[PDB]
Amino acid sequence: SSVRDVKTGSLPTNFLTGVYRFWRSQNPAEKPHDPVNDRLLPAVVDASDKRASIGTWATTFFCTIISCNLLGLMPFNEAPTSGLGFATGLGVSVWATATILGLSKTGFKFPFIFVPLETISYTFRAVSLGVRLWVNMLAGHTLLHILTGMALALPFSLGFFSMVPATFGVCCLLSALVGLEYLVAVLQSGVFSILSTVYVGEFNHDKFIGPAAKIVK
Amino acid sequence: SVLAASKMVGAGCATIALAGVGAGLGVMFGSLINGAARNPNIAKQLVGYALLGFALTESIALFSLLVVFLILFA
Amino acid sequence: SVLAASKMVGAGCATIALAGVGAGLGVMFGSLINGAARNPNIAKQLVGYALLGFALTESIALFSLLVVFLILFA
Amino acid sequence: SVLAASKMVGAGCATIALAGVGAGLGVMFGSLINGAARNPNIAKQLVGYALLGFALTESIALFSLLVVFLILFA
Amino acid sequence: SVLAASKMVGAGCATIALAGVGAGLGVMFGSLINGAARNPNIAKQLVGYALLGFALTESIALFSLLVVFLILFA
Amino acid sequence: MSYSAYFAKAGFQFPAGLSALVAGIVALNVCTGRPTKGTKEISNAEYNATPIGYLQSPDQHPTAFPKVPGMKDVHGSPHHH
Amino acid sequence: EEEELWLLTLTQQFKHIQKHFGIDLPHSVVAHMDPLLIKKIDWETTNALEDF
Amino acid sequence: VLGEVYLKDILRTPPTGAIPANVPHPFQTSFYTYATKKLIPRHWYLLGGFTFTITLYGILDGLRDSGKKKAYDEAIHAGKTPYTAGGH
Amino acid sequence: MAVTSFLGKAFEKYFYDFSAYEQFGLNRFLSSKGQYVALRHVGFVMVGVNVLLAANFPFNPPFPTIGMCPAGWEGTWVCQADKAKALEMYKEWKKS
Amino acid sequence: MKLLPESLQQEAATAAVVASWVLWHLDTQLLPTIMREHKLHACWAAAAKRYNEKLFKLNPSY
Amino acid sequence: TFAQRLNSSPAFSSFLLKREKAESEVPPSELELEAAQKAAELEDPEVALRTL
Amino acid sequence: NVSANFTKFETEQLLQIVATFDAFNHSSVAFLDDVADSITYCNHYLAPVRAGADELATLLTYYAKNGHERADLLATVARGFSEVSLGKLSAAQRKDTVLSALKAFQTFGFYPESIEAVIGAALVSPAEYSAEELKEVEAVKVAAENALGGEFVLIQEG
Amino acid sequence: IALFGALSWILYRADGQSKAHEWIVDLNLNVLQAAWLISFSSLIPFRAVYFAFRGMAPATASTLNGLKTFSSISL
Ligand SMILES: [Zn+2]
Known part of the structure; x- marks a missing residue:
């Protein structure tokens, strides 16, 4: 019942402010025809009410996927996103959120060969958004497994501290691939949330109510 | 068995298609660099277009990968 | 059986064609970036053209994928 | 056995796809050189874009490599 | 044996991928020449970018070569 | 003078609803509705008739640092089907 | 000295905020000094207008 | 003159005796207020999407279990053991 | 000695003031500090791989070996591609 | 290699529970704090001119 | 100054920023420094009374 | 109570209170001034x-x-x-x-x-x-x- | 509770990693990840990162500009 006290200007607050304002800037509000004043203010507030919370949703998915992606790069830990059902459940949930928003715009029930083709490529967003995250989190990890297996195979057979140039090269390649995994982790969380914004923002368009009567001049 | 053996062969021939997918993706990112160097005042917008194209072209990649799973575990 | 085994091999050789489809799609999206950088005042229109071409080129992709299903489950 | 033998064949046909991945990566780095020579005052930024594209295109590479491990040890 | 024989076949099909790697590397070095001829006052910097891209594209080459060793001696 | 000592007074604190997140993940892990990853529900007559070593099966007891890959800690039941 | 308390309270409060904001100012001191501004910002957050 | 009573709850100076407790937001006070005022009317699309994925993955788990049951019954009817032997 | 305060101050003076790049005089051999960070990274990886292999070296590798063998084992459990064969040979080796 | 989980629905529900907790903690704990700290600065920056002009008009000291 | 107040903030008492200084990122301008000096001269209220 | 704590009341609550004070006739000059001050200055301007x-x-x-x-x-x-x-x-x-x-x-x-x-x-x-x-x-x-x-x-x- | 649960989790995860099939592979993956944590401690310019994060939020990117003195002078 007692909330904690927060310091203004904290680094998590600043980072999260920048992240939220980045994801909010993905789907900006449309500039109305009229000059925005107290006459147009309830129409602007209503237009914000019709818009989905894509800033909050994209910030949620970005934080929850960059955390699970950077979990795989911590020692003794694995990424939850490297599991299939987790990452693909996030992707199918984003596609279902965009679909449910678009169905709520059109009246809650679902709409020659063009209709099957575009429906297949739309339904493939459900697979694609989660699977492109899951196999990317499986990517550097399974390559890392096999490569550190051979990196173990060299000094297990040539001696513990002998032939250091060959194992030096293989460990340099291993270090470069864990750094690439860091880049791919941050970048896959970013790509997921960029795509969530462009998928949900397809159905984020409602018409401005505006003034139905004015006093001109 | 002949079936699981041909499943491995068909999986390799299935994931052949990632070559042209990666080639088109590299062409698109090179044109992203060229467009950002030609006119950087819209470069952020261009990056958005690039990522848009990236996701769409990687759909083809997952299409090929789907076929690999349909050969490997289906 | 020899039939289902060759079905897996023919499915992999069938989805080979997604390589050139993804390569052409990457070329088209790179030219989208180049056209948006050359003249951004019609860039939204160019994006529409790109998506038009995207859908049409992905028709070829689904053509290849149709053949995969015609080998796998037909 | 026929199974492990076809695993080797499918692994080689699987890692065929690194050709087009390396070709697109070389195209992207050549366009990095062209963009840095055209306008060097943003060249550091262009290098960042290049590395961004590099990581994304190498995702396709690891995709193909994943399939190799799925044929070799799975 | 059938296993070591298919190991040789899979090793050859594995090192097929050096073709596209060398093609992208040649494209990148040709664009290095074009960028050095267009603006030589940053040419040394461009050479550094080229070598950067070279190492990164080579990584794909060693990826393919890794698979060859995983077929030949693993 | 600053508010630095006032913020140094407050210790480490978890996020505000972390107990709900832990109690959601744990409740998803323990309310599976199915046996526990290599076990099987048996009759009570079998469970009381069976000794402790025959109930254990060697795949669910792998060796901590196995000198050969596949070493198991228990040998399971000597009775084989 | 007819309205000196209001003007000097405005000066004192904004001077303390500007001295400490973004460095070490607690949110409790902010909500104590200006409770109505915090009430209005909380109304904005409550009514899904946080990006207004 | 303007006394304290004109700025009693409107404007306060920096505290001199003790730092007060932080004023809670209504969402921090109550989960019911957050649920009825923001979580349902703004995030019911996400909630329905998570519901759809949990339902669909339960359907896929049912399909996987029915396939395992069909293979188990086909192994039992053919006089084969349904699984192969363990390593130990 | 408070258990965590002394640990914090000792780790602070190890983290900041202690530098093996300066105390061992590695500016003579190495161009940069960042080159030292890269070499120390790969050296930490190599030292970790070697001590994890030295902590238990007589074991049969789960990772696939490149046709090779450790020292003089040659045909023992350590150089057996068949793992069931390696387990049963490990029991005879352990008999001694 | 592990590909398929023991339960797809349990893992998807784990993803839903984690993302719903992150959504609640963002909307309830992080965004009110962020909006207080942001909107104090934003309201003062947006109101500096009008506030100083109105206070300059109301001030009888000059 | 602003960098001096940042140096006394809790975030520069954190472990990764114990040896860093806020003046190293953005140095204080001389108007800021002479204003800090002039404000230090005026923290005595009697001196401010006599000066004014 | 409303006049003593007018800064704490919300427009969402004050409209419901004023509707009851309007249903039967009941008003003060101080009550009307405090309700107007609370809606105008003590609450958000987008609350109406x-x-x-x-x-x-x-x-x-x-x-x-x-x-x-x-x-x-x-x-x-x-x-x-x-x-x-x-x-x-x-x-x-x-x-x-x-x-x-x-x-x-x-x-x-x-x-x-x-x-x-x-x-x-x-x-x-x-x-x-x-x-x-x-x-x-x-x-x-x-x-x-x-x-x-x-x-x-x-x-x-x- | 945090550090006891973190050490509990690390010991539980290391025990599960050792019982795995390619256990030594996992135990050297831990070394590979701890190496990059150590290199992040060396390479990252933490003061520049702090001041770059201060520029992401508009509340800390600028000085709070509000009430001026000349409007609120009392005499
Ligand atoms: Zn692992």
Whole structure:
């Protein structure tokens, strides 16, 4: 019942402010025809009410996927996103959120060969958004497994501290691939949330109510 | 068995298609660099277009990968 | 059986064609970036053209994928 | 056995796809050189874009490599 | 044996991928020449970018070569 | 003078609803509705008739640092089907 | 000295905020000094207008 | 003159005796207020999407279990053991 | 000695003031500090791989070996591609 | 290699529970704090001119 | 100054920023420094009374 | 209690309180001043937008029947009247809301821009109104035309 | 509770990693990840990162500009 006290200007607050304002800037509000004043203010507030919370949703998915992606790069830990059902459940949930928003715009029930083709490529967003995250989190990890297996195979057979140039090269390649995994982790969380914004923002368009009567001049 | 053996062969021939997918993706990112160097005042917008194209072209990649799973575990 | 085994091999050789489809799609999206950088005042229109071409080129992709299903489950 | 033998064949046909991945990566780095020579005052930024594209295109590479491990040890 | 024989076949099909790697590397070095001829006052910097891209594209080459060793001696 | 000592007074604190997140993940892990990853529900007559070593099966007891890959800690039941 | 308390309270409060904001100012001191501004910002957050 | 009573709850100076407790937001006070005022009317699309994925993955788990049951019954009817032997 | 305060101050003076790049005089051999960070990274990886292999070296590798063998084992459990064969040979080796 | 989980629905529900907790903690704990700290600065920056002009008009000291 | 107040903030008492200084990122301008000096001269209220 | 703690009350609560204080006649000068101060200065300026036009009309006729005139509260509560807020009302409810709001605005002589949303809500559907009510709506329209310095136009879809 | 649960989790995860099939592979993956944690401690310019994060939020990117003295002078 007692909330904690927060310091203004904290680094998590600043980072999260920048992240939220980045994801909010993905789907900006449309500039109305009229000059925005107290006459147009309830129409602007209503237009914000019709818009989905894509800033909050994209910030949620970005934080929850960059955390699970950077979990795989911590020692003794694995990424939850490297599991299939987790990452693909996030992707199918984003596609279902965009679909449910678009169905709520059109009246809650679902709409020659063009209709099957575009429906297949739309339904493939459900697979694609989660699977492109899951196999990317499986990517550097399974390559890392096999490569550190051979990196173990060299000094297990040539001696513990002998032939250091060959194992030096293989460990340099291993270090470069864990750094690439860091880049791919941050970048896959970013790509997921960029795509969530462009998928949900397809159905984020409602018409401005505006003034139905004015006093001109 | 002949079936699981041909499943491995068909999986390799299935994931052949990632070559042209990666080639088109590299062409698109090179044109992203060229467009950002030609006119950087819209470069952020261009990056958005690039990522848009990236996701769409990687759909083809997952299409090929789907076929690999349909050969490997289906 | 020899039939289902060759079905897996023919499915992999069938989805080979997604390589050139993804390569052409990457070329088209790179030219989208180049056209948006050359003249951004019609860039939204160019994006529409790109998506038009995207859908049409992905028709070829689904053509290849149709053949995969015609080998796998037909 | 026929199974492990076809695993080797499918692994080689699987890692065929690194050709087009390396070709697109070389195209992207050549366009990095062209963009840095055209306008060097943003060249550091262009290098960042290049590395961004590099990581994304190498995702396709690891995709193909994943399939190799799925044929070799799975 | 059938296993070591298919190991040789899979090793050859594995090192097929050096073709596209060398093609992208040649494209990148040709664009290095074009960028050095267009603006030589940053040419040394461009050479550094080229070598950067070279190492990164080579990584794909060693990826393919890794698979060859995983077929030949693993 | 600053508010630095006032913020140094407050210790480490978890996020505000972390107990709900832990109690959601744990409740998803323990309310599976199915046996526990290599076990099987048996009759009570079998469970009381069976000794402790025959109930254990060697795949669910792998060796901590196995000198050969596949070493198991228990040998399971000597009775084989 | 007819309205000196209001003007000097405005000066004192904004001077303390500007001295400490973004460095070490607690949110409790902010909500104590200006409770109505915090009430209005909380109304904005409550009514899904946080990006207004 | 303007006394304290004109700025009693409107404007306060920096505290001199003790730092007060932080004023809670209504969402921090109550989960019911957050649920009825923001979580349902703004995030019911996400909630329905998570519901759809949990339902669909339960359907896929049912399909996987029915396939395992069909293979188990086909192994039992053919006089084969349904699984192969363990390593130990 | 408070258990965590002394640990914090000792780790602070190890983290900041202690530098093996300066105390061992590695500016003579190495161009940069960042080159030292890269070499120390790969050296930490190599030292970790070697001590994890030295902590238990007589074991049969789960990772696939490149046709090779450790020292003089040659045909023992350590150089057996068949793992069931390696387990049963490990029991005879352990008999001694 | 592990590909398929023991339960797809349990893992998807784990993803839903984690993302719903992150959504609640963002909307309830992080965004009110962020909006207080942001909107104090934003309201003062947006109101500096009008506030100083109105206070300059109301001030009888000059 | 602003960098001096940042140096006394809790975030520069954190472990990764114990040896860093806020003046190293953005140095204080001389108007800021002479204003800090002039404000230090005026923290005595009697001196401010006599000066004014 | 409302006069002692007027800064703590919300517009969402004060509209419900003022509706009860309007239902039976009960008012003070200090109560009206504190409710007006609380809605205008102690609450968010977009709180009448989230209110519903019937509650704002009830508060307007409360201040009109008591004769207490606050131009700042009039601007704040006038901001809540809209095509959105009147569109949320049913037609029989919108008739009473529009008539009472126009009567309060004509009593005070205050004609903001947002009165275009109220008068328009009468003139888009003039069939439900009587001839007397249409006459009083036309009188408010002429007065608001003179105060805002222009002519009232009905705007179609475009 | 945090550090006891973190050490509990690390010991539980290391025990599960050792019982795995390619256990030594996992135990050297831990070394590979701890190496990059150590290199992040060396390479990252933490003061520049702090001041770059201060520029992401508009509340800390600028000085709070509000009430001026000349408007609020009392005499
Ligand atoms: Zn692992």
